[PDB]
Design a protein around this ligand. Structure first.
Ligand SMILES: [Cl-]
Ligand SMILES: [Cl-]
Ligand SMILES: [Cl-]
Ligand SMILES: [Cl-]
Ligand SMILES: [Cl-]
Ligand SMILES: [Cl-]
Ligand SMILES: [Cl-]
Ligand SMILES: [Cl-]
Ligand SMILES: [Cl-]
Ligand SMILES: [Cl-]
Ligand SMILES: [Cl-]
Ligand SMILES: [Cl-]
Ligand SMILES: [Cl-]
Ligand SMILES: [Cl-]
Ligand SMILES: [Co+2]
Ligand SMILES: [Co+2]
Ligand SMILES: [Co+2]
Ligand SMILES: [Co+2]
Ligand SMILES: [Co+2]
Ligand SMILES: [Co+2]
Ligand SMILES: [Co+2]
Ligand SMILES: [Co+2]
Ligand SMILES: [Co+2]
Ligand SMILES: [Co+2]
Ligand SMILES: [Co+2]
Ligand SMILES: [Co+2]
Ligand SMILES: [Co+2]
Ligand SMILES: [Co+2]
Ligand SMILES: [Co+2]
Ligand SMILES: [Co+2]
Ligand SMILES: [Co+2]
Ligand SMILES: [Co+2]
Ligand SMILES: [Co+2]
Ligand SMILES: [Co+2]
Ligand SMILES: [Co+2]
Ligand SMILES: [Co+2]
Ligand SMILES: [Co+2]
Ligand SMILES: [Co+2]
Ligand SMILES: [Co+2]
Ligand SMILES: [Co+2]
Ligand SMILES: [Co+2]
Ligand SMILES: [Co+2]
Ligand SMILES: [Co+2]
Ligand SMILES: [Co+2]
Ligand SMILES: [Mg+2]
Ligand SMILES: [Mg+2]
Ligand SMILES: [Mg+2]
Ligand SMILES: [Mg+2]
Ligand SMILES: [Mg+2]
Ligand SMILES: [Mg+2]
Ligand SMILES: [Mg+2]
Ligand SMILES: [Mg+2]
Ligand SMILES: [Mg+2]
Ligand SMILES: [Mg+2]
Ligand SMILES: [Mg+2]
Ligand SMILES: [Mg+2]
Ligand SMILES: [Mg+2]
Ligand SMILES: [Mg+2]
Ligand SMILES: [Mg+2]
Ligand SMILES: [Mg+2]
Ligand SMILES: [Mg+2]
Ligand SMILES: [Mg+2]
Ligand SMILES: [Mg+2]
Ligand SMILES: [Mg+2]
Lengths: 172, 172, 172, 172
């Protein structure tokens, strides 16, 4: 084993690799949403840019796991980044709903990794998750839920005027 | 077809999607190189950061194709991003050799897309490739080739001192 | 022939004159749109100013062809600038639709001139078109298409509220 | 008991005193390394200064435990600070190896104190360790491991040139 490795369970190392992959997967999904809202027949640029920014953030989430792995003396092992579930995302409401579910998936994985770290008595990994991931997730989930509520209030999916208004006044 | 689409062949649209995927693939390979050189048993941080920067640049290459696709009225279609060919990259020389070959692969794909664009009489796509991709590729290939020459001169792979010296004085 | 003229085909020279005229024609059409949206019974000033700006840009497009002609040793030959197709432009959606079609007409002419330049083996004229015209056209067409999509989403032509909202939040 | 003391187990109080002593011990070891590399027959001043800085940091680690003890209403109890294990440290590689082991010892003690705090249901002490100690330890261990790898690559212990080069280009 690595000269630096101390108190780092094989199962945690593997789970960190799987989490890295899921962050990459989330990033790629958000990229797809960006491209959809930039289509000439969709054309919601502030929405598009929201998703582009999220994609970038998710990729940074992934990079932080790679650095973490090396710091602990684990070994980064990459897998394919699966394409997103959909090719097209309907409208702002459908997309935000999909983002909520994605975030909930990511959050569940983070919470599961925290339970594993707890079980293996790895306080450093617990602290990393709590200090760099769990609160950011809660905030993001809240933001997306708030957006969904407002999209529904605006009459989505049917009310195009409402969709326009959201792009112009929310997504800031 | 899209209201914006004009002089944009289906075959070019598809080839742009495939190129997008290859840029993503290149990005991911460079990320793997970064992680390898950041290992505690490798520990060539300037080398690592070179590859991290390249990864970031390649992802920007990919994003520019997505924007291009939408601007022309094509439709972005994503595929899985295949994991890199290797899990570990040997040493600085082996990695740089692999990067040269990757770049040559990417460049060939760009040149093939330019030939297709030429065949389909798409000057806008030709100009995009020439103005945003082909020269950047030539420069990168030259830089990597120069590095290889210097790594060989330094005695790689056997000469660890030489490898150290490269990390400390080249990769700027 | 001119002392400066080199590799400049008579057919390209003539086509440059015709293109100059079409740019002037486009400019004049946009001026008409400006005046329509400034009417007291139309009164969409941000829309009006969008079209005024476009008119100005198109006139600059024309001037650049005159300079080009002289630089190559061709001779500028002017024709009448035909009045626009319509005297009145309906509403924002109808106008944007007409602008899309105008731009597509202009773009087609530019692409046809590029094919002619290619046929006559005139790389300088190809480069001029690619570097000064073709990308600006793609961007403009995309912008107008995006606007159309949003006008439709807003309920045009029937939804006056939607038209108002567009003038106040798009056309920036 | 102290008027301030709440949820602070006698066993944790004692363990904090023992940890304080170990931080002092680590500091003193690093001072010894500093003095060794400053010898006229060793003369690796950047190496020396690395160890001097570490000594200073370790003493600050100790002071933070004294403050912690008082904040919780425990009582600081000091013991002798044992002299370092060695009087002379061989060379840069041997010293870095000894530092790695020292850090691993300190880290193990911190992790053991965290387990005790967990067992006694003391979240404040857990948080203190996680927020002020555990990550700093991981970073330091990684840094030292990286140095070891590079010293080995440089040919230590035999390659004096390599040792010189390390002092002049690493230890920044
Ligand atoms: Cl371990
Ligand atoms: Cl294990
Ligand atoms: Cl967080
Ligand atoms: Cl409003
Ligand atoms: Cl087409
Ligand atoms: Cl086609
Ligand atoms: Cl380029
Ligand atoms: Cl040197
Ligand atoms: Cl001529
Ligand atoms: Cl001629
Ligand atoms: Cl242009
Ligand atoms: Cl108590
Ligand atoms: Cl007690
Ligand atoms: Cl810390
Ligand atoms: Co469509
Ligand atoms: Co933007
Ligand atoms: Co994430
Ligand atoms: Co990054
Ligand atoms: Co997220
Ligand atoms: Co966030
Ligand atoms: Co408003
Ligand atoms: Co190893
Ligand atoms: Co760095
Ligand atoms: Co690239
Ligand atoms: Co980007
Ligand atoms: Co590249
Ligand atoms: Co480059
Ligand atoms: Co030097
Ligand atoms: Co009237
Ligand atoms: Co005005
Ligand atoms: Co024009
Ligand atoms: Co002018
Ligand atoms: Co125009
Ligand atoms: Co060309
Ligand atoms: Co060019
Ligand atoms: Co324009
Ligand atoms: Co002596
Ligand atoms: Co000094
Ligand atoms: Co310490
Ligand atoms: Co102090
Ligand atoms: Co320490
Ligand atoms: Co905890
Ligand atoms: Co905490
Ligand atoms: Co430190
Ligand atoms: Mg080893
Ligand atoms: Mg394992
Ligand atoms: Mg699949
Ligand atoms: Mg926090
Ligand atoms: Mg909020
Ligand atoms: Mg349509
Ligand atoms: Mg097709
Ligand atoms: Mg495979
Ligand atoms: Mg260039
Ligand atoms: Mg150079
Ligand atoms: Mg003459
Ligand atoms: Mg003639
Ligand atoms: Mg007439
Ligand atoms: Mg250009
Ligand atoms: Mg836009
Ligand atoms: Mg008292
Ligand atoms: Mg006691
Ligand atoms: Mg003794
Ligand atoms: Mg912290
Ligand atoms: Mg470092």
């Amino acid at each position: 084993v690595s000269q630096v490795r101390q108190n780092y369970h094989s199962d945690c190392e593997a789970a960190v690799n799987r989490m890295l992959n899921l962050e990459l997967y989330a990033s790629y999904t958000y990229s797809s949403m960006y491209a959809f809202f930039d289509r000439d027949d969709v054309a919601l640029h502030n929405v598009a840019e929201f998703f582009k920014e999220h994609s970038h953030e998710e990729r940074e989430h992934a990079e932080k796991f790679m650095k973490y792995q090396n710091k602990r003396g684990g070994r980064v092992v990459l897998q394919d980044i699966k394409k997103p579930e959909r090719d097209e995302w309907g409208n702002t409401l459908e997309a935000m709903q999909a983002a909520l579910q994605l975030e909930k998936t990511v959050n569940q994985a983070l919470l599961d990794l925290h339970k594993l770290a707890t079980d293996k008595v790895d306080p450093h990994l617990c602290d990393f998750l709590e200090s760099e991931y769990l609160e950011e997730e809660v905030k993001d989930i809240k933001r997306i839920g708030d957006f969904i509520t407002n999209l529904k209030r605006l009459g989505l999916p049917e009310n195009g005027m409402g969709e326009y208004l959201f792009d112009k006044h929310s997504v800031k």
